[PDB]
């Protein structure tokens, strides 16, 4: 129940604001900046500010704070969802999120803000649907918004019906400094880039553990996703009844389903780090990386970030495989590897000096994070079975999909 | 500038009118008071171009309260535009009519609102529903006089799921501001009809549809079972707010569910994966998810019993998320994951957040106090932290030890020697007072208690009132226990706190202690050094009456602030 | 003696800093932040004089960039303003049409001029031409 | 701008 | 080619489940 | 070798604070790499970049040894950079300037006049407790030289050493003898400053330093006569710094002697009329002369002229002039207090001024001008100012009002009423430290207790969130329960006190969430004392004490346990230790 959603800037200047209820004076935005400065300087800064009886909820964008003031006990979650939808719409319409576009497309920006929500109640959220009525370069509103299918525009015609899927894997590993992995969760991501003619209704079928058990085929390798969240086009009733994944695919790239379950397998990369840090004399980086993934798989663009000392200087690198570059901006050593075949073992020996003068304050021990990304690898073993592409006119579809395994929250606690 | 803009706007060329409108819009956005030119733009309002009409409407809405008198020259244009064949123009006019905060302007807009109430366009229906809600918020009496309640009620029973959701949201908002009199509650048929359109409502329509169920109170288990069965699919929605609304609805319905039936177990099993999914959301919604979990934790704590790994704060997690993670872990602390909690707290004590370090120390102390099975582990962790040579950590460990001693001091005699020499030079009032109290109450395992208290007696008359009282209590306890080595110390303390102490409460305490010492030293052991009863810890659980009310208020501002809905609004 | 002298801009950026009192770095930063906040939250008719922490915090900025001084409560107030005006005039004469851009670029020269003008919070050069001649001679040395 | 302006304008 | 795993053809449904 | 200008431009090109920090770290990495290699060619540029970064707010701990290495270098630019680094990033608590003593000693005998002056300035700016001990001998050696450009530096170094080491002033007595004939203004100013510092440090040199009064008077007369000069003449004031120093020395000299005051009386009289205050320098000189006259035993005419000058300056619209006049009036509060009463209207009007400093000065002057006859009249004005005072001035106004009431209160009843009104109006602005003073004042007064007890009872039932007022009310109840309610042992006629409302109020305060554990202790002590003081409501507080003995606070729990033990096992001895506490000053 936000009173007015506004777009601010890094210097406190409001790029654009649009009142929806009018219950709060527009001059309250001036006090938002001092309140944020005080909260940050005292550690009490939070996304939802509070200026007396009015709460100033704001989120940090690429360059501006999307502040949405409110007065009553409105749905904070609803405000957050509206802000996320607005951010997605801005990203779709504007390729850049900075002050260069905020002051460059205000003519269409005002119309989009007016059309998106009214009186604090969001009404339009389809970026593709909104692009059919609001353009920066007007006809009646499309019937798709009025119709039940607001995620599949009818009448779309394509020369070919090719859909590019994406089996994106997220390997999140939380290895403590004691050597044990605490948080080992893998989040699936079934994203498809559908480009076909008409309004096809995808009939998804994969190797799910629940589906195999229900059909009686619970004996092969089936993925038991702890959390499975369908997209907007996905029908909740069909999945609730018999795990029937039937929905109308959108026009373009969209996230249909996203698996989320814990992992009980060994890490794909085993990283052993050593710290022979002399007392203000030198430091040793006994970093050893063991690839626990299958030898048939290669981790392309592997970047094992090793945090070096804050005041460290004059580093010397004695490694075996992979380029090592010390970036002073990040204050860490990135064990950069172009391609890392599975089962590889790379040994590195860092050595640098330290200033004689001791530091006045501690710097902390940031965790070691790697940026491995091995495509065409399915650690979870979930295999897609079929995708029921049905059209009223009738056409032969040629769906495509690629499985990509990358490194997510794969942080390693430092000693 | 202003004169040139006025001359351009007073011309018959559309090309210059568009440029003038763009310049005026840029000036207002740049922070220029362009309300003085509002009457000039009034003449250049009825234009065929759709781009300039939106700008004119926006300028009028933004220049309506500033110049209410000059706004009387816009009713005719709105009335003319309220019948345009283009649905977009009608929707824009409906939105602009409700956005004008004019008391004398909404009076003449009732006829267009009545005409557009039966608008065939679903977008037009939504726009009229929004305009009716805006008019009712501006004038509840005007809305009642116009008789729009019947039309809003009949809107929910028509086609257009988006328009139906908008009408339901408008009705809920009107009833939200209403005094509960003549409520818009509906029977099970209306609930079933809304559930049938729930699968057809949009992302925003789902929230509006689920908000209505938050007010209805089920009376039968079969109806509750059907409602739970229909709300179960809502947990598989990518919209986090829709997931939050569905969780709130399920929790509200669980207040009438029967634990004997298997529906409660299935609902509990299906709620944990939703919580796990919500915990990995965006940082802005992470705090909301944590607040919702904390609010629902006190109601059914057996749902998230096995959800402990996800409660760990991430390295890149925000400060607000890090603070909430510790509270979630403390609320969900159990003996099964005691070792994991201790390991996380030990890792959380090596960070650089001083506030984060203090919060971690407080959480560790709360976990140690709640569960006596890990008391030895907590004591060992506190000793290691004290040996960590951290000033804030040292004060936190001293406070934790002092709190633990008053709670479980039966087997706390093995730590007095270690804490006897732990760099007592710290001047923190919360740590020095705790150390003094621990020494006074635990003045048996330390053979040099009198010598340690000598250093703290140099500035007793100007240390602190609480510190002075604690030192006096420790001296009295030491004299009562061992008066051979503290016979002169008690007299010195009485002289310093009775003659050179000007504190009223401190002076009274010193006088009482002196009177007790001069009356009967034998009785002082049974009067001053008595065995205190069990200390009643402050229960962190909210009151049952407040918990039930917070259950209905799910997703609102009151859940993050942990305050009553009427205790935070103005 | 002047405890500290700091040249701070209107936006809050500090162009000069010279403290004659030995304080911790965190404490010095906190004091500077508090002084900037007090100056940034002060009007144009406040007399340019503040008794902060029992210190005569005198603020008088002749341009966008402001200037501050901190003297003990034992001398007159107008003397600080006269000294500040004299220092500004000497800096302008040494540089020639001093602006904010040149102050950042000539930070080392500004520090040298301040050292040659006032040392330890006390006035070191009463005349305006002798100090300028000495600064020019020192610069010409290489 | 406001930074290129003279401190005293002399 | 393309980094992240080459695109592969997909079926229409579980032919082995009727 | 990145130049400082390039770094400044790069910093100016950065937008985000994180981006600025990243750029600063990127530059510092190269700087540290160059420093670790023992680079000596482009060391000046690295030093300048490091100084700019340190001024920008980045750590510079690693860049300390490079400054020490460059300080002992031979290049003039390197020496200047090292001196700047030592002055900026070197401090007494740094501990890295200890090795710089050898470099300073080596540079102390340098032939170049720029290196020696820079070293002297650095030593003065970073004077330490141990460096001055090993550098005191060198400072005195340069003090007897004839270098005009170095005489001021030597005087400044001596003054800094004396300030840092007050026990080293004994070695400077014979070095400054016969130095009042310096033609250069800087050398004379340095000598005057050194003499003033020596006089202010200890009074042993006042007699020896008081002999040069005629020379100082003649110098001041000559300077006043020489009103035209190219150097030191700003805004028509020639050598304003020298005149200010002379006025300060005259004020500090002879502050308690008659011959010194009489010798400089003519100079003060001539200056008080032969000076124009149109510019800021003239106003400052007039203020300094007025302060010197006020601080010395001057003539009645000088005092009248100073009062007239202060009164004329009080009407000036300048905020700085008004602040200076207020400060002068506050300084001359005890002295010429009778003549200060003529500006009562101005003092009252200054409270309403739109200047925070002006308002504070007016409030301080009003507080210092409170006498034994205008206290009653000024009480209403003080209450009005406190009621409509700024949030930062409410606590100070309340403290000043309490001090004025405790110092020159016309009567105990009026003072008690004023204190009660302040406590009711102060709320969260009354300092907690004043609570013991108020308790002592209440205990000392033993004649007005029934009215005070009734007022405290009335003001405590209304609100309880005021910690100082709540504590004062609790202490008053505990001390005068025997007088607050009369004949309340059993049921009686309806009166203000019924013997049960006090217990309920105390229980609510103890259980109220608006307790800081200090008022809770006072309430518990009052409840315990009410067992013997009050005999009407008995056998009911024992249950509360037993229940209150398990409180979360360790001290509160111990107090509750002791109270329960006393109530359950020492019922007959309760009155044996409840005697009234003694009253002392």
Swiss-Prot record, chain B:
Using the UniProt record, give the first listed, main subcellular location.
Golgi
Domain of life assignment: Eukaryota
Name any Gene Ontology BP term.
intracellular protein transport
Where, per the database record, does this protein carry N6-acetyllysine? Answer: 305
Q: How does it sit in the membrane?
A: Peripheral membrane protein
Kindly list the positions at which 3'-nitrotyrosine occurs in this protein.
561
Q: Where in the cell is it found?
A: Golgi apparatus; Cytoplasmic vesicle, Clathrin-coated vesicle membrane
Where is it made, tissue-wise? Answer: Widely expressed.
**Alphabetized GO MF terms:** clathrin binding; protein kinase binding
Q: What does this protein do?
A: Subunit of clathrin-associated adaptor protein complex 1 that plays a role in protein sorting in the late-Golgi/trans-Golgi network (TGN) and/or endosomes. The AP complexes mediate both the recruitment of clathrin to membranes and the recognition of sorting signals within the cytosolic tails of transmembrane cargo molecules.
Question: Assembly state and interactors?
Answer: Adaptor protein complex 1 (AP-1) is a heterotetramer composed of two large adaptins (gamma-type subunit AP1G1 and beta-type subunit AP1B1), a medium adaptin (mu-type subunit AP1M1 or AP1M2) and a small adaptin (sigma-type subunit AP1S1 or AP1S2 or AP1S3).
Q: What is this protein called?
A: AP-1 complex subunit beta-1
What's the source species for this entry? Answer: Homo sapiens (Human)
Swiss-Prot record, chain C:
GO cellular component entries: AP-1 adaptor complex; clathrin-coated pit; cytoplasmic vesicle membrane; cytosol; early endosome; Golgi membrane; intracellular membrane-bounded organelle; lysosomal membrane
Q: Has keyword Protein transport?
A: yes
What is the recorded phenotype of mutating residue 33 to W?
Answer: Risk factor for PSORS15; results in decreased TLR3 targeting to the endosomes indicating impaired function
Extract one GO molecular function annotation from the record.
clathrin adaptor activity
Q: What is the membrane topology listed in the Swiss-Prot or TrEMBL record?
A: Peripheral membrane protein
Which Gene Ontology BP annotations are present? intracellular protein transport; melanosome assembly; platelet dense granule organization; protein targeting; vesicle-mediated transport
**Where does it live in the cell?**
Golgi apparatus; Cytoplasmic vesicle membrane; Membrane, Clathrin-coated pit
CDD domains according to UniProt = AP1_sigma
Keyword Nucleus in record: no
Tissue specificity comment: Widely expressed.
Top-level taxon in the UniProt lineage: Eukaryota
- TM ranges are none
* Keyword set, alphabetical order: Coated pit, Cytoplasmic vesicle, Disease variant, Golgi apparatus, Membrane, Protein transport, Transport
| InterPro entries tied to this protein | AP1_sigma, AP_complex_ssu, AP_mu_sigma_su, Clathrin_sm-chain_CS, Longin-like_dom_sf
Q: Which Gene3D superfamilies match?
A: 3.30.450.60
State a single Pfam family of this protein: Clat_adaptor_s
Q: What family does this chain come from, according to its entry?
A: Belongs to the adaptor complexes small subunit family.
Role of this protein: Subunit of clathrin-associated adaptor protein complex 1 that plays a role in protein sorting in the late-Golgi/trans-Golgi network (TGN) and/or endosomes. The AP complexes mediate both the recruitment of clathrin to membranes and the recognition of sorting signals within the cytosolic tails of transmembrane cargo molecules. Involved in TLR3 trafficking.
Full protein name: AP-1 complex subunit sigma-3
Recorded name of the encoding gene: AP1S3
Curated annotation (Swiss-Prot), chain E:
Q: Which compartments does it reside in?
A: Cell membrane; Endoplasmic reticulum membrane
Q: Region Disordered: what ranges? A: 2-18
Changes after translation: (Microbial infection) Polyubiquitinated in a post ER compartment by interaction with human herpesvirus 8 MIR1 protein. This targets the protein for rapid degradation via the ubiquitin system.
Supply the induction statement: Up-regulated by IFNG, and pro-inflammatory cytokines IL1B and TNF.
Residues recorded as bearing Phosphoserine in the entry? 6, 12-13, 15
> Linked disorder?
Alleles A*02:01 and A*24:02 are associated with increased susceptibility to diabetes mellitus, insulin-dependent (IDDM). In a glucose-dependent way, allele A*02:01 may aberrantly present the signal peptide of preproinsulin (ALWGPDPAAA) on the surface of pancreatic beta cells to autoreactive CD8-positive T cells, potentially driving T-cell mediated cytotoxicity in pancreatic islets. Allele A*24:02 may present the signal peptide of preproinsulin (LWMRLLPLL) and contribute to acute pancreatic beta-cell destruction and early onset of IDDM.
What does the entry's free-text domain comment contain?
The alpha-1 domain is a structural part of the peptide-binding cleft.
Similarity annotation: Belongs to the MHC class I family.
Protein name per its UniProtKB record: HLA class I histocompatibility antigen, A alpha chain
UniProt organism field: Homo sapiens (Human)
Q: What gene is behind this protein?
A: HLA-A
Part of the full-length chain shown: 338 to 355 of 365
Swiss-Prot record, chain F:
Q: Where in the cell is it found?
A: Golgi apparatus; Cytoplasmic vesicle, Clathrin-coated vesicle membrane; Cytoplasm; Cytoplasm, Perinuclear region
Q: How does it assemble?
A: Adaptor protein complex 1 (AP-1) is a heterotetramer composed of two large adaptins (gamma-type subunit AP1G1 and beta-type subunit AP1B1), a medium adaptin (mu-type subunit AP1M1 or AP1M2) and a small adaptin (sigma-type subunit AP1S1 or AP1S2 or AP1S3). Interacts (via GAE domain) with RABEP1. Interacts with EPS15. Interacts with SYNRG/gamma-synergin. Interacts (via GAE domain) with AP1AR (via coiled-coil domain). Interacts with CLN3 (via dileucine motif); this interaction facilitates lysosomal targeting.
Q: Which residues of the full protein are shown?
A: 4 to 588 of 822
The record's comment on protein family reads: Belongs to the adaptor complexes large subunit family.
State the coiled-coil residue ranges: none
**What keywords does the record list, in alphabetical order?**
Coated pit, Cytoplasm, Cytoplasmic vesicle, Golgi apparatus, Membrane, Protein transport, Transport
| Entry membrane topology | Peripheral membrane protein
As for what it does, the entry says: Subunit of clathrin-associated adaptor protein complex 1 that plays a role in protein sorting in the late-Golgi/trans-Golgi network (TGN) and/or endosomes. The AP complexes mediate both the recruitment of clathrin to membranes and the recognition of sorting signals within the cytosolic tails of transmembrane cargo molecules.
Tissue-level expression reads: Widely expressed.
One annotated Gene Ontology cellular component of this protein: trans-Golgi network membrane
Output this protein's name: AP-1 complex subunit gamma-1
Signal peptide extent: none
Q: Which organism is it from?
A: Mus musculus
């Amino acid at each position: 129940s936000a009173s007015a959603v506004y777009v601010l800037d890094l210097k406190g200047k409001v790029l654009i604001c649009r009142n929806y209820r009018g219950d709060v004076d527009m001059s309250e935005v001036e006090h938002f900046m001092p309140i944020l400065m005080e909260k940050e300087e005292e550690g009490m800064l939070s996304p939802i500010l509070a200026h007396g009886g009015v709460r100033f909820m704001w989120i940090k964008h690429n360059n501006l704070y999307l502040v949405a003031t409110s007065k009553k006990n409105a749905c904070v979650s609803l405000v957050f969802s509206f802000l996320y939808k607005v951010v997605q719409v801005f990203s779709e319409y504007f390729k850049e999120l900075e002050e260069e576009s905020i002051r460059d497309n205000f003519v269409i920006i005002y119309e989009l803000l007016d059309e998106l929500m009214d009186f604090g109640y969001p009404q339009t959220t389809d970026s593709k649907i909104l692009q059919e009525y609001i353009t920066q370069e007007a006809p009646r509103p499309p019937a798709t918004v009025t119709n039940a299918v607001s995620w599949r525009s009818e009448g779309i015609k394509y020369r070919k019906n090719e859909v590019f899927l994406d089996v994106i894997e997220a390997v999140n590993l939380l290895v403590s400094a004691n050597g044990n992995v605490l948080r080992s969760e893998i989040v699936g991501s079934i994203k498809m880039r559908v480009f076909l003619s008409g309004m096809p209704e995808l009939r998804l079928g994969l190797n799910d553990k629940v589906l195999f058990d229900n059909t009686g085929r619970g004996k092969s390798k089936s993925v038991e996703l702890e959390d499975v969240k369908f997209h907007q086009c996905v029908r909740l009733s069909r999945f609730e009844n018999d795990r029937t994944i039937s929905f109308i695919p959108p026009d373009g790239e969209f996230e249909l389903m996203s698996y989320r379950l814990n992992t009980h397998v060994k890490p794909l990369i085993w990283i052993e780090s050593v710290i022979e840090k002399h007392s203000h004399s030198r430091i040793e980086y006994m970093v050893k990386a063991k690839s626990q993934f299958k030898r048939r798989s290669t981790a392309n663009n592997v970047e094992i970030h090793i945090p070096v000392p804050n005041d460290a200087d004059s580093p010397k690198f004695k490694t075996t495989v992979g380029s090592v570059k010390w970036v002073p901006e990040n204050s860490e050593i990135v064990w950069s590897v172009k391609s890392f075949p599975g089962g590889k073992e790379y040994l590195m020996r860092a050595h640098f000096g330290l200033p004689s003068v001791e530091a006045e304050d501690k710097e902390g021990k940031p965790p070691i994070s790697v940026k491995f990304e091995i495509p065409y690898f399915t650690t979870s073993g979930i295999q897609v079975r079929y995708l029921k592409i049905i059209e009223k006119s009738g056409y032969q579809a040629l769906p495509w999909v690629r499985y990509i395994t990358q490194n997510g929250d794969y942080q390693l606690r430092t000693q | 500038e202003i004169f040139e803009l006025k001359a351009e706007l007073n011309s018959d060329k559309k090309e210059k009118k568009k440029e003038a409108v763009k310049k005026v819009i840029a000036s207002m956005t740049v922070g220029k008071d362009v309300s003085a030119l509002f009457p000039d733009v009034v003449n250049c309002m009825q234009t065929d171009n759709l781009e300039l009409k939106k700008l004119v409407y926006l300028y009028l809405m933004n220049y309506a309260k500033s110049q209410p008198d000059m706004a009387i020259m816009a009713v005719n244009t709105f009335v003319k535009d309220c019948e345009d064949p283009n649905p977009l123009i009608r929707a824009l006019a409906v939105r602009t009519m409700g956005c004008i905060r004019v008391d004398k302007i909404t009076e003449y807009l009732c006829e267009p609102l009545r005409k557009c109430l039966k608008d065939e366009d679903p977008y037009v229906r939504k726009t009229a529903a929004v305009c009716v809600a805006k008019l009712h918020d501006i004038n509840a009496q005007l809305v009642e006089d116009q008789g729009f309640l019947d039309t809003l009620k009949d809107l929910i029973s028509d086609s257009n799921p988006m328009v139906v959701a908008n009408a339901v949201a408008a009705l809920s908002e009107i009833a939200e501001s209403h005094p509960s009199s003549n409520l818009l509650d509906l029977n099970p048929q209306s609930i079933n009809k809304l559930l049938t359109a729930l699968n057809e409502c949009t992302e925003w329509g789902q929230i509006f549809i689920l908000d209505c169920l938050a007010n209805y109170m089920p009376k039968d288990d079969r109806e509750a079972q059907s409602i739970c069965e229909r709300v179960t699919p809502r947990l598989s929605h990518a919209n986090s707010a829709v997931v939050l609304s569905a969780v709130k609805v399920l929790m509200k319905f669980m207040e009438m569910l029967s634990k004997d039936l298997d529906y409660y177990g299935t609902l509990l099993k299906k709620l944990a994966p939703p919580l796990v999914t919500l915990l990995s959301a965006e940082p802005e919604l992470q705090y909301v998810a944590l607040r919702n979990i904390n609010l629902i934790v006190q109601k059914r704590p057996e749902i998230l019993k096995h959800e402990m790994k996800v409660f760990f704060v991430k390295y890149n997690d925000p400060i607000y998320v890090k603070l909430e993670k510790l509270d979630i872990m403390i609320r969900l602390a159990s003996q099964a994951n005691i070792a994991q909690v201790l390991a996380e707290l030990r890792e959380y004590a090596t960070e650089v957040d001083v506030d984060f370090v203090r919060k971690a120390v407080r959480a560790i102390g709360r976990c140690a106090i709640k569960v006596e099975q890990s008391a030895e582990r907590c004591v060992s962790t506190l000793l290691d932290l004290i040996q960590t040579k951290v000033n804030y950590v040292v004060q936190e460990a001293i406070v934790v030890i002092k709190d633990i001693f008053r709670k479980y001091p039966n087997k706390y005699e093995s730590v007095i020697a270690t804490l006897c020499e732990n760099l007592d030079s710290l001047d923190e009032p919360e740590a020095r007072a705790a150390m003094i109290w621990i020494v006074g109450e635990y003045a048996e395992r330390i053979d040099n208690a009198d010598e340690l208290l000598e250093s703290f007696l140099e500035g007793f008359h100007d240390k602190s009132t609480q510190v002075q009282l604690q030192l006096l209590t420790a001296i009295v306890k030491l004299f009562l226990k061992k008066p051979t080595e503290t016979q002169e110390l008690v007299q010195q303390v009485l002289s310093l706190a009775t003659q050179d102490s000007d504190n009223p409460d401190l002076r009274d305490r010193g006088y009482i202690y002196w009177r007790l010492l001069s009356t009967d030293p034998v009785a002082a052991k049974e009067v001053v050094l008595a065995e205190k009863p069990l200390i009643s810890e402050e229960t962190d659980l909210i009151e049952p009456t407040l918990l039930d009310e917070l259950i209905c208020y799910i997703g609102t501002l009151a859940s993050v602030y942990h305050k009553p809905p009427s205790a935070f609004v103005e | 003696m002047i405890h500290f002298i700091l040249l701070f801009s209107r936006q809050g950026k500090l162009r000069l800093q010279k403290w004659y009192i030995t304080l911790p770095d965190k404490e010095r930063k906190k004091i500077t932040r508090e002084i900037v906040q007090i100056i940034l939250s002060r009007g144009h008719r406040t007399s340019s004089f503040v008794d902060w922490k029992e210190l005569k915090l005198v603020y008088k900025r002749y341009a966008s960039l402001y200037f501050c001084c901190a003297i003990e409560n034992q001398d007159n107030e107008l003397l600080t303003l006269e000294i500040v005006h004299r220092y500004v005039e000497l800096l302008d004469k040494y540089f020639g049409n001093v602006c904010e851009l040149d102050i950042i670029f000539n930070f080392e020269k500004a520090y040298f001029i301040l050292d040659e003008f006032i040392i330890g919070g006390e006035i070191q050069e009463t005349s305006k031409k002798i100090a300028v001649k000495a600064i020019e001679d020192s610069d010409m040395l290489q | 701008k406001g930074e290129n302006t003279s401190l005293l304008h002399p | 080619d393309r980094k992240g795993g080459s695109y592969s053809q997909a079926a229409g449904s579980d032919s082995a489940q009727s | 070798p990145i130049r400082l200008r390039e770094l400044i431009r790069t910093i100016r090109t950065a937008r985000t604070q994180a981006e600025e920090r990243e750029m600063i770290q990127k530059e510092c990495a190269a700087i540290r790499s160059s420093f670790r290699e023992e680079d000596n060619t482009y060391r000046c540029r690295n030093v300048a970049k490091l100084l700019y970064m340190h001024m920008l707010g980045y750590p510079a701990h690693f860049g300390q040894l490079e400054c020490l290495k460059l300080i002992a270098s031979q290049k003039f630019t390197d020496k200047r950079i090292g001196y700047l680094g030592a002055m900026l990033l070197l401090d007494e608590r740094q501990d890295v300037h200890l090795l710089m003593t050898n470099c300073i000693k080596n540079d102390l005998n340098h032939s170049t006049q720029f290196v020696q002056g820079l070293a002297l300035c650095t030593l003065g700016c970073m004077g330490s407790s141990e460096m001055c001990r090993d550098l005191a001998g060198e400072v005195e050696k340069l003090l007897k030289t004839s270098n005009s450009y170095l005489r001021k530096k030597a005087a400044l170094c001596a003054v800094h050493v004396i300030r840092k080491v007050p026990e080293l002033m004994e070695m400077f007595l014979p070095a400054t003898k016969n130095l009042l004939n310096e033609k250069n203004h800087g050398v004379l100013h340095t000598s005057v400053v050194l003499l003033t510092e020596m006089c202010e440090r200890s009074p042993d040199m006042l007699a020896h330093f008081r002999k040069l009064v005629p020379q100082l008077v003649r110098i001041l007369k000559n300077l006043i006569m020489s009103g035209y000069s190219p150097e030191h003449d700003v805004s028509g004031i020639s050598d304003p710094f020298l005149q200010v120093r002379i006025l300060r020395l005259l004020r500090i000299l002879g502050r308690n002697d008659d011959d010194s005051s009489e010798a400089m009386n003519d100079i003060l009289a001539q200056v008080a009329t032969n000076t124009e205050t149109s510019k800021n320098v003239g106003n400052a000189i007039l203020y300094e002369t007025v302060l010197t006259i006020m601080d010395i035993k001057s003539e009645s005419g000088l005092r009248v002229l100073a009062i007239n000058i202060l009164g004329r300056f009080l009407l000036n619209n300048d905020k700085n002039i008004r602040y200076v006049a207020l400060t002068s009036l506050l300084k001359t509060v005890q002295t010429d207090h009778n003549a200060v009463q003529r500006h009562r209207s101005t003092i009252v009007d200054c409270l309403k001024d739109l200047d925070v400093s002006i308002k504070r000065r007016a409030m301080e002057l009003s507080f210092a001008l409170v006498n034994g006859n205008n206290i009653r009249g000024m009480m209403k004005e003080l209450l009005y100012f406190l009621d409509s005072c700024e949030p930062e001035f409410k606590a100070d106004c309340a403290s000043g009002i309490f001090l004025a009431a405790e110092k020159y209160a016309p009567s105990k009843r009026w003072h008690i009423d004023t204190i009660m009104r302040v406590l009711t109006t102060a709320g969260s602005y009354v300092r907690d430290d004043a609570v013991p003073n108020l308790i002592q004042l209440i205990t000392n007064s033993v004649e007005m207790h029934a009215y005070t007890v009734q007022r405290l009872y009335k003001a405590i039932l209304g609100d309880y969130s005021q910690q100082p007022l709540v504590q004062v009310a609790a202490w008053c109840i505990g001390e005068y329960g025997d007088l607050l309610v009369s004949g309340q042992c059993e049921e009686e006629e309806p009166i203000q006190v019924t013997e049960d409302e006090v217990l309920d109020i105390l229980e609510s305060v103890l259980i109220s969430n608006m307790s800081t554990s200090v008022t809770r202790g006072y309430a518990l002590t009052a409840i315990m004392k009410l067992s013997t003081r009050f005999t009407c409501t008995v056998n009911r507080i024992k249950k509360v004490v037993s229940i209150y003995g398990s409180s979360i606070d360790v001290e509160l729990q111990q107090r509750a346990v002791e109270y329960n033990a006393l109530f359950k096992k020492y019922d007959h001895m309760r009155s044996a230790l409840l005697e009234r506490m003694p009253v002392m000053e």
